[PDB]
């Protein structure tokens, strides 16, 4: 309702919407690659999943550049923030396209993989935690504004190690947390417990992405060639 808050919300909702196609807009398609048998790693699934992740990293960087004040931080701190939040944002995005009935997740080109295929594509031991998080996310009934704000709050975090200006990042995050709080109450006034519940997802996300950093390690051993360039930059 405040003029400054409304503009911040509009900017972040627009940033998310313009870098994230919704499940409803996409034409779902399946693949037969080890859809029924669990394996350590399906090579054809890995190549598709690694390429889709590369494209999604590019979109996350485009999203970050549209968040107010992000491009005003040092290049060193933008890089530190993007690398620290990389897996958190990709995981929140893949989990936003969850279909409970078929237990599938849909990627940005429409590729829809079941629990077994997500496991075989490279998730492995991460799979049940990612799918549990998707199920916890679903009842929250979040819209573009809230998903976008959750992504911006996860990226713009002062607690990341090796930040040249952590207090500057802390200051930049505060207007986003305030904007999320008022928007959640304005959109859903009957349930005032939703705001700290949404923030709990960020803690779960950090926990899943900490395990995810260990999965990058075990995957580098299993995959034939080296990791794609951009993925190596973000996670190594």
């Amino acid at each position: 309702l405040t003029p400054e808050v409304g503009e911040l919300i509009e900017k972040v909702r627009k940033a998310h919407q313009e870098t994230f196609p919704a499940l409803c807009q996409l034409g779902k398609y399946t693949t037969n690659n080890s859809s029924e048998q669990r394996v350590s790693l399906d090579i054809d699934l890995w190549d598709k999943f690694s390429e889709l992740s590369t494209k999604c990293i590019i979109k996350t960087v485009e999203f970050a550049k549209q968040l107010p004040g992000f491009t005003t931080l040092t290049i060193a701190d933008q890089i530190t923030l993007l690398k620290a939040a990389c897996l958190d944002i990709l995981i929140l995005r893949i989990c936003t396209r969850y279909t409970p009935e078929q237990d599938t997740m849909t990627f940005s080109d429409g590729l829809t993989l079941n629990r077994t295929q997500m496991h075989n594509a490279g998730f492995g031991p991460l799979t049940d935690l990612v799918f549990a998080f998707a199920n916890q996310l679903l009842p929250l009934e979040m819209d573009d504004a809230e998903t976008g704000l959750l992504s911006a709050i996860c990226l713009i975090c002062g607690d990341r190690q090796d930040l040249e200006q952590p207090d500057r990042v802390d200051m930049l995050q505060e207007p986003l947390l305030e904007a999320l709080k008022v928007y959640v109450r304005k959109r859903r006034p009957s349930r005032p417990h939703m705001f700290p519940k949404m923030l709990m997802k960020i803690t779960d996300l950090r926990s899943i992405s900490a395990k995810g950093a260990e999965r990058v390690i075990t995957l580098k051993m299993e995959i034939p060639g080296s990791m794609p360039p951009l993925i190596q930059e973000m996670l190594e």
């Binding site: 550049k65 933008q78 890089i79 951009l230 930059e233």
Partner: peptide, 10 residues
Amino acid sequence: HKILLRLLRX
């Protein structure tokens, strides 16, 4: 950091 940068630098 390459990529990144690129990216960035914008």
